[PDB]
Amino acid sequence: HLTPEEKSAVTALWGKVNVDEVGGEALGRLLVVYPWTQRFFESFGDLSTPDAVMGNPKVKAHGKKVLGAFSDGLAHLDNLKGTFATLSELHCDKLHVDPENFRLLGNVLVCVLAHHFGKEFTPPVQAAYQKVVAGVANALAHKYH
Amino acid sequence: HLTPEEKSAVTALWGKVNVDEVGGEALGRLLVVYPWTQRFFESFGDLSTPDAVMGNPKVKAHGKKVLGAFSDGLAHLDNLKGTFATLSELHCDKLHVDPENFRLLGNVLVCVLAHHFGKEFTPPVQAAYQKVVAGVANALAHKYH
Amino acid sequence: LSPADKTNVKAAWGKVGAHAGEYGAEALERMFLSFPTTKTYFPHFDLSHGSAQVKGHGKKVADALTNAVAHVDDMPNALSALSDLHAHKLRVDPVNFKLLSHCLLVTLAAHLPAEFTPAVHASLDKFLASVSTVLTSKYR
Amino acid sequence: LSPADKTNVKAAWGKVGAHAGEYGAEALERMFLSFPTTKTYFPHFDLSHGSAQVKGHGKKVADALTNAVAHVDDMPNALSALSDLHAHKLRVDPVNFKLLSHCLLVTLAAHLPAEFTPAVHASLDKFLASVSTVLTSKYR
Numbered sequence: 024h025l026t027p028e029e030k031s032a033v034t035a036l037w038g039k040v041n042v043d044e045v046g047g048e049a050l051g052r053l054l055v056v057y058p059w060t061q062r063f064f065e066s067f068g069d070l071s072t073p074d075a076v077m078g079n080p081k082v083k084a085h086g087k088k089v090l091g092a093f094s095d096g097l098a099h100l101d102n103l104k105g106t107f108a109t110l111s112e113l114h115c116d117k118l119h120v121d122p123e124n125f126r127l128l129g130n131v132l133v134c135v136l137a138h139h140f141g142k143e144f145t146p147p148v149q150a151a152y153q154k155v156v157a158g159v160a161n162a163l164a165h166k167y168h
Numbered sequence: 169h170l171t172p173e174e175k176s177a178v179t180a181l182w183g184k185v186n187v188d189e190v191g192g193e194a195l196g197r198l199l200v201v202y203p204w205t206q207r208f209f210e211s212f213g214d215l216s217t218p219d220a221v222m223g224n225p226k227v228k229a230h231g232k233k234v235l236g237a238f239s240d241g242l243a244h245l246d247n248l249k250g251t252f253a254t255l256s257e258l259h260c261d262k263l264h265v266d267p268e269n270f271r272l273l274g275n276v277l278v279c280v281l282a283h284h285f286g287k288e289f290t291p292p293v294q295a296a297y298q299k300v301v302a303g304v305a306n307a308l309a310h311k312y313h
Numbered sequence: 314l315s316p317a318d319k320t321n322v323k324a325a326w327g328k329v330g331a332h333a334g335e336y337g338a339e340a341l342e343r344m345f346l347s348f349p350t351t352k353t354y355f356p357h358f359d360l361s362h363g364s365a366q367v368k369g370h371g372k373k374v375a376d377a378l379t380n381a382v383a384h385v386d387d388m389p390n391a392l393s394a395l396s397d398l399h400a401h402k403l404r405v406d407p408v409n410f411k412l413l414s415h416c417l418l419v420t421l422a423a424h425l426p427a428e429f430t431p432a433v434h435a436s437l438d439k440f441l442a443s444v445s446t447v448l449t450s451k452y453r
Numbered sequence: 454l455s456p457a458d459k460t461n462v463k464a465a466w467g468k469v470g471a472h473a474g475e476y477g478a479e480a481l482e483r484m485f486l487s488f489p490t491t492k493t494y495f496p497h498f499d500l501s502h503g504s505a506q507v508k509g510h511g512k513k514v515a516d517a518l519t520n521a522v523a524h525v526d527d528m529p530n531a532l533s534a535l536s537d538l539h540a541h542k543l544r545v546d547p548v549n550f551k552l553l554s555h556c557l558l559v560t561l562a563a564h565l566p567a568e569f570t571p572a573v574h575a576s577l578d579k580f581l582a583s584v585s586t587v588l589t590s591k592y593r
């Protein structure tokens with residue numbers, strides 16, 4: 024349920040996002056801030072320090088994929104469920120990630136946007152992004168519902 | 169998504185439930201165990217002790233309504249969303265109850281069923297009831313989604 | 314935990330008596346069946362009904378909970394090694410302690426007719442929440 | 454909180470400097486707009502932008518957080534009165550501390566270009582989670 028002003032807030036900011044970087048930043052911070060999530064990324068090699076996490080090329084590459092799916096949801100705000108269906112099967116039925124972590128990654132992304140855009144990330148812009156990341160998290164959790 | 173065996177577990181137990189009592193027991197225990205929920209029930213009068221809560225006639229009466237809605241969901245397991253639509257508007261848009269409390273009340277109901285049925289409330293029967301109360305909580309939270 | 318809470322948890326502990334390890338195994342089984350995401354922490358277990366591994370693990374869990382109740386005013390110290398294990402080695406998601414705690418309460422409800430009163434339910438919920446707080450205090 | 458966490462929270466505190474009360478008010482506004490369920494705890498407030506009441510309240514919240522950081526190894530004692538207030542009088546749902554804490558982190562991110570590194574983010578998250586643990590320790 025985004026209003027047109029909420030939609031404007033979201034798309035005008037997203038146009039400015041570096042899509043090669045921001046997803047790795049959010050995934051890396053998830054792994055640093057919520058370290059239990061490292062359980063799913065054993066194959067990624069050195070996660071021993073925050074610098075090792077943030078500089079790990081597999082974290083950056085994987086985060087690029089993660090952000091690509093966010094971008095696909097931003098383009099389909101009225102059908103997030105179909106947009107996220109195969110990813111919901113993957114994360115829920117195959118990986119068994121607790122869906123609370125979908126909420127945490129969304130909020131980490133919000134922090135990354137706040138850090139990159141500073142004052143431009145106003146309280147109304149944040150509110151619109153909170154609706155988007157909650158909608159993406161609920162769509163990704165559909166197979167638990 | 170209940171299987172037929174899950175459906176059998178649920179309906180065979182529910183047939184035995186005292187629908188005049190179990191909802192008041194679960195609502196009273198919610199108010200005792202998670203006392204912040206008393207914030208929504210100021211008009212109910214004496215909630216000062218667990219005995220005062222459990223013996224309060226308004227808690228018993230209100231719990232009877234709450235259980236009536238659970239019973240309606242058990243009869244419509246493939247359309248919980250429409251079943252709970254007006255209650256979702258009420259709880260989300262008018263009352264602003266955090267939907268985590270829908271999960272807590274469902275789990276309190278599970279504890280009440282375990283206490284009343286003892287060994288008959290087997291681990292598989294509990295699992296089936298957990299699917300039902302999660303589905304009811306997600307349906308009631310639809311207007312937040 | 315208030316004095317009354319300590320009293321209530323002790324009532325429950327004493328009634329459960331020597332069944333505690335059996336009830337721990339039942340609570341684990343309840344969790345695996347009700348919350349199948351928790352199973353992936355036990356890939357090397359057979360989680361089928363009657364599994365010797367679940368029986369053994371439930372005795373360990375029960376022993377840790379009894380240690381926590383026996384040292385209820387010093388639980389951070391009593392559970393320190395287990396807090397390290399769950400966060401650092403096992404990477405248990407904090408959500409999962411809420412799931413096991415609920416299953417431990419349901420197990421007690423299913424075996425404690427007289428004792429699982431609303432007040433004792435509240436006291437056991439607070440005790441398990443306090444144990445969970447310590448066991449999630451060491452992520453780093 | 455580890456020694457490094459205390460170091461990092463102190464770095465952030467010192468950079469925020471005398472802006473803390475303004476940033477507290479901004480974090481509250483972020484919470485009310487992003488999580489409108491939290492508004493019902495403030496029915497007698499005007500929550501519009503520029504509200505003197507939100508400005509005043511944000512200074513109170515900031516002062517409490519600075520008290521907690523100044524007494525970081527004794528936070529249960531430092532925040533005891535506020536824990537009583539939030540649980541007993543205000544009946545704040547525990548979920549809501551996660552919402553305010555997130556909004557406090559976003560506010561800091563929006564004002565701390567150099568300091569909001571991944572490590573300092575983690576340290577601030579742990580500090581706010583620890584404050585929240587104390588402020589939800591008194592339900593009864």
Ligand code: HEM
Nearest residue numbers: 060063064088089092093110120124125126128129160163
């Ligand atoms: C909530 C927002 C999330 C989005 C949008 C997202 C998106 C993705 C995408 C696009 C894929 C690549 C799938 C493929 O290669 O086709 C991926 C894979 C994966 N995701 Fe996520 N994800 C989210 C959250 C998480 C979280 C919170 C976790 C764990 C903590 C996780 C762990 C995994 C894993 C382990 C893989 C690899 C799967 C494999 O290759 O076998 N995801 N995710």
Ligand code: HEM
Nearest residue numbers: 205208209233234237238255265269270271273274305308
């Ligand atoms: C999750 C399962 C729940 C169900 C099925 C449920 C069901 C109901 C029903 C059937 C009604 C009566 C509505 C009418 O009279 O038409 C009611 C009202 C209400 N419910 Fe719930 N409820 C749930 C959870 C909660 C919780 C967790 C809270 C608060 C903690 C809450 C607080 C209220 C309030 C304050 C009313 C009165 C509304 C009014 O009369 O103005 N409900 N609920």
Ligand code: HEM
Nearest residue numbers: 351354355373374377378395398403405409410413414444
């Ligand atoms: C009431 C909370 C809990 C208690 C008291 C507890 C206690 C214990 C104890 C005593 C051990 C054995 C330690 C070894 O003997 O060093 C253990 C191991 C473990 N626990 Fe927990 N635990 C708790 C919650 C959880 C949760 C929520 C999970 C996951 C859903 C979990 C997963 C594990 C695993 C996977 C092991 C290692 C098992 C083995 O490989 O044999 N624990 N726990």
Ligand code: HEM
Nearest residue numbers: 491494495513514517518535538543545549550553554584
């Ligand atoms: C970082 C967590 C928090 C801190 C440090 C904090 C701090 C404070 C402080 C210092 C007061 C003023 C106490 C009076 O001066 O005695 C207060 C009051 C209050 N707080 Fe919090 N609080 C926190 C989280 C919350 C949350 C999450 C809510 C609700 C969503 C909330 C709701 C209230 C309310 C409604 C008041 C009373 C306001 C008044 O009527 O003027 N607080 N808080």
